[PDB]
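Obj: model holo form, ligand = NAI.
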Amino acid sequence: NNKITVVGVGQVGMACAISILGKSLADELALVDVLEDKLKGEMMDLQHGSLFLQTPKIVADKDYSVTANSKIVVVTAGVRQRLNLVQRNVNVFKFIIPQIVKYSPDCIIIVVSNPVDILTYVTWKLSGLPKHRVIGSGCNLDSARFRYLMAEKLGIHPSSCHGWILGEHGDSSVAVWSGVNVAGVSLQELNPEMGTDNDSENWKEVHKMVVESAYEVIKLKGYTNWAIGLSVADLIESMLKNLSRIHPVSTMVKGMYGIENEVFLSLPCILNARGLTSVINQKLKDDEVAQLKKSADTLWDIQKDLKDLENLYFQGLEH
Amino acid sequence: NNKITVVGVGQVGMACAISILGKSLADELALVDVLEDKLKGEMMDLQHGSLFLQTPKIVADKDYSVTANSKIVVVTAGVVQRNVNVFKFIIPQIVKYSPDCIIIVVSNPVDILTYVTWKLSGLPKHRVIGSGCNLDSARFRYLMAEKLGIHPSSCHGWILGEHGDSSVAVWSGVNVAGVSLQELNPEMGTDNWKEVHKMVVESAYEVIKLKGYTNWAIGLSVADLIESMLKNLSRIHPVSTMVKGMYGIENEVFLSLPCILNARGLTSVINQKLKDDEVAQLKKSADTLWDIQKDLKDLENLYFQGLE
Amino acid sequence: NNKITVVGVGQVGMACAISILGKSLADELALVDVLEDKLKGEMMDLQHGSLFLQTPKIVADKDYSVTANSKIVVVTAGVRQQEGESRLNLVQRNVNVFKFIIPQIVKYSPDCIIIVVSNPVDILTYVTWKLSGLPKHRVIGSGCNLDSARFRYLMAEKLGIHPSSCHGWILGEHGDSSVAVWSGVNVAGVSLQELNTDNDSENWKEVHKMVVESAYEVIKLKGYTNWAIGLSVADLIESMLKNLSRIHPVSTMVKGMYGIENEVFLSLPCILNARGLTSVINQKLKDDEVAQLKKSADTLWDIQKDLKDLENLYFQGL
Amino acid sequence: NNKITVVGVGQVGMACAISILGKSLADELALVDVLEDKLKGEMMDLQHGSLFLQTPKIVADKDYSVTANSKIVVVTAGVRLVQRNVNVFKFIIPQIVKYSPDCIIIVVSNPVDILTYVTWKLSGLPKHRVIGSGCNLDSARFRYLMAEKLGIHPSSCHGWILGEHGDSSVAVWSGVNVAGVSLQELNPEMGTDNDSENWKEVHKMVVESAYEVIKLKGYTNWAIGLSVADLIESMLKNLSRIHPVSTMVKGMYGIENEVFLSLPCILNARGLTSVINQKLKDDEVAQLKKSADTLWDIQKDLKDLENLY
Ligand SMILES: NC(=O)C1=CN([C@@H]2O[C@H](COP(=O)(O)OP(=O)(O)OC[C@H]3O[C@@H](n4cnc5c(N)ncnc54)[C@H](O)[C@@H]3O)[C@@H](O)[C@H]2O)C=CC1
Ligand SMILES: NC(=O)C1=CN([C@@H]2O[C@H](COP(=O)(O)OP(=O)(O)OC[C@H]3O[C@@H](n4cnc5c(N)ncnc54)[C@H](O)[C@@H]3O)[C@@H](O)[C@H]2O)C=CC1
Ligand SMILES: NC(=O)C1=CN([C@@H]2O[C@H](COP(=O)(O)OP(=O)(O)OC[C@H]3O[C@@H](n4cnc5c(N)ncnc54)[C@H](O)[C@@H]3O)[C@@H](O)[C@H]2O)C=CC1
Ligand SMILES: NC(=O)C1=CN([C@@H]2O[C@H](COP(=O)(O)OP(=O)(O)OC[C@H]3O[C@@H](n4cnc5c(N)ncnc54)[C@H](O)[C@@H]3O)[C@@H](O)[C@H]2O)C=CC1
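Output (holo structure tokens):
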């Protein structure tokens, strides 16, 4: 079978669930949340439209037993957008991550909750699963937003546009301008001043707008959901169909790019049935690798004092 | 060539939008609403996922000039507490900008608002249709699949009449694998099968009681009607249409009937006997549109409004 | 791992493979054939289109090692009908071919669902079931799934609607003695049997004869039939690999049913999912339908009881 | 509506037809061929499977009156150095524009670069409506060879093969890249005789893989069938995607002759919106001019009574 579990019947979870059923990727959809009513309501609503889909079974319950033998588990629980956010979201992940592995040992966890980069490391610690099976959303949407900003810029489809945004999902995202190209035309060679301050084509602004556009939409409708459901389902299609496609997702970066701390950052990785086949370790400019080490230093700065990651009880360890 | 305009960016509004984009049906998505912030925010979110879709352009604006030359217009806007006051502002404007178009009314009651849309638009009958009992039929086929352990597609059930209660369920048409389920149980739907029919009616009431609104079930059915129409498949669907002169009905009412849907809209309606107890429920539906809309407000927007 | 193997790179086989890749039902497509050049030729030709497909691995080799751990095996190998040949004439030839390809499939794919396409499908599904040793719920034949597709299309152009909106069920033997259950023929729930051998409506019985003559006509025109059957095979695979639990008219074991007394494979409405054939709908047909249904089984076993290749011992009796 | 005509019901012809039906692109498929039996048999075969398709009408006839009001016409008719197809194109191309002038013609018959030019003259249609198969298939074969050696999906590794559809092709090594990194940057000897990875042999296999297919099974079928289906989808949906189709190169890259060469172009409902003028290297522009020089000499033997207007 192809069982997929969605922990979160909110705006991002339902957008993800509707994208899974729209792609016929799952034969058994499992919805898990803490709201009894909202959980049963979204399940029945999805079940009523099961005639127009190809997912026979759609089970949903608060007990994680309905998630048994799931291939992929998409975690969308928590609260939206700061050390406060990560402190309270790891509080939720502490009660749901160990329960997912208890019923779905051979699954692939997809962390969506923000901060993704941090919560993916939190998920990898409490789950005990290999790092190649714990993948986070990361900059898979940052590259989609960047590729769309270039689509309406040149007048072509985002498919023909190729722009890679890596690093940390947020303002500290790295824009590898050497890979920005369409139709095999490296635009960095047309404009050698790409990314710097003295740039005719302010690509620095369109790079910043990738983070702004995410912040803006949260001001107008109050959230973001559709761009992720399509991005999350796009990752599962690469994984379930064994396509072995390269995607910029958050992965264990320690030991790569001169970083020594156990953190998760977005990098190109191949996705098949097993999860992360390999993590592309390309060569970046001196300034691009600077943010990779700086953001990882800031990421580890938070996770090192996360007392929700306690594997042992000997915690008279006050400081 | 395949421009689709969705009026309303609410729950049902975006449910059809994400379902239309999930099917590569429209090369142009136009969203309209009164709340420009939610209207602009929802459009920008769908745009960020353009890489994973096959729609070149997604536009949105309060002005209806952005909905010009649309092949399909889905009306999902809505607030005796009827929605004609809102319909008088959203309907005359879509036809002004896209005359040659097809209308899919979704606001409740579907059978009532679809008639006001046809009157305010002046378009023919085949181009003004509503969801009707297409969702009630899908809900009914799921209950048969849940009890029989098969797929709703392999199941076959036809719910007609009004959207919700007072709906008709043809028991002679209920069948699976060609086997008429009424033949195995001659006393089907009579003194259990009527609860299954009433469960369709109350399956929605439970949804709004839990999550507060019906969302994805309707959005998927609207995309199913759009696919069968934009592809000229000429498929049969139980949509709400004008049924004057059929089954002893002599009033301009809109009821759910099995109709053929394609690029020209509602070309034909399926002729059926419906026994005798079922034919009455269609005439018993004289409380819809008649009795209700005979005390209408103003199904014609006039500039003389120094009123209140 | 949704691995699919296609035995036979002929017209029907290639039409099945192109339909499987079109729907992205398999992540690993294995091809097996005796013609090694054509086998390797069709592989590279399909592999060049990997850019527009969703199947990463496309392997092909005459040895059945490339078929290990296959979920569904579509068998299209054998000799083809020729002009005005009879479907019951290609038996001794394709049964001898099935003698060397069916056992080899189970050796490398013990847990798999075999789909028989080679004609006569009703006879060879029985030969496969006996040669493979797998349960009857996993040895499924094409049956009348295509016969119903051609029937529901003929009534589609007649009523001006889509074949999907049409609802017709053709059961029995795939070919001449097909049983057209007119009691189940309906459109939008309206059983079009309002008309009630002669008049029908205009002739709601020539359409059945057209389903039988359609196969011969296409063979007389282009020489074979591959596209129509190729799409029907993909429809059955989609119902299995996706656990759709949909009802299809496929050939299955029908003993005990309709008074049939000996092991015979006939087409009946069956529910297909990941487990294969999980249920068979036993309708209550008219006395004329069960008579033609049973008659098709009498002639079927008559040809199966003498086949000198399913002999596992040394039967020198003539 | 989205009517599509496929001229020729042969192997390559039916590979496209079965591909357009598998994507629900057109609502009416029209087949045209000279053989009555094969044309009618292939038509009824597709009609029998109408249940599993989203195509209502499927027609076929000898006269081109059945192809009236078509949006895209795929010309895959001819014979698999002696141009026996320009004679056949004389009797079929004018018939297409006579019953459906407002359309887009996709040439598939080989030599495409020679026949797409022949189509452009007989049809008299704008250059943005005459499409040739070009190196879009050569790019798919090239991207697969990169995926075969890297263990990834062909859609993840990007490569652009331009020039002629055949032996004299151009591999823009400056456009090859996987995961956003320039493969030429990793190995600067890409394309030269000092290649550490022998990429010139990979380019040679692209123009030789088609030879192997015709040697094993006798013809190339499904590779081109899926390629044309990808170009039609980028057009019928106005996706505005960049594809290396065969287009005119007169004026650009210094060629002052009217020839057709494979170059990346934006495909949408109109056909060709733009033709990318990539700044190629010296050895690449030389081949694009050397091939265009000899190709015009091939299409200078217009003494099959074409001789311009
Ligand atoms: N990586 C990305 O691109 C983005 C990530 N997100 C993430 O989605 C998350 C929230 O999902 P949203 O739909 O935006 O808001 P939401 O208010 O709908 O929260 C999602 C669900 O989590 C539930 N929940 C909280 N704790 C739970 C627990 N212990 N067990 C089960 N359910 C629990 C809530 O009931 C809710 O239904 C946030 O962390 C947010 O950052 C959303 C936008 C962008
Ligand atoms: N046909 C069916 O089976 C179903 C019926 N519905 C109907 O759909 C309608 C909307 O349902 P929801 O989306 O869940 O409520 P909603 O409040 O989330 O969306 C309704 C939309 O109307 C907009 N609106 C109101 N007046 C407008 C105007 N003059 N112009 C533009 N936009 C206007 C509001 O912005 C709103 O977004 C209701 O009438 C409801 O009864 C809901 C589910 C299924
Ligand atoms: N069940 C059904 O509904 C249908 C039945 N069919 C059947 O499909 C069959 C195939 O028709 P075609 O592909 O057009 O003729 P074909 O001449 O292409 O034969 C198919 C393949 O069998 C191969 N073959 C022969 N012995 C083999 C072996 N031992 N191992 C592997 N491959 C072997 C040949 O190389 C060939 O490529 C016919 O027997 C026909 O009756 C056709 C239409 C529908
Ligand atoms: N661009 C590319 O990469 C490809 C090039 N091709 C070309 O496509 C052409 C056909 O290839 P195949 O289908 O495998 O050979 P084929 O002999 O099977 O089909 C060619 C069709 O032309 C028909 N025909 C001849 N004159 C006609 C006319 N005046 N009107 C209508 N039909 C006519 C024949 O009946 C035949 O069916 C060849 O020229 C070949 O070089 C083949 C594969 C791909």
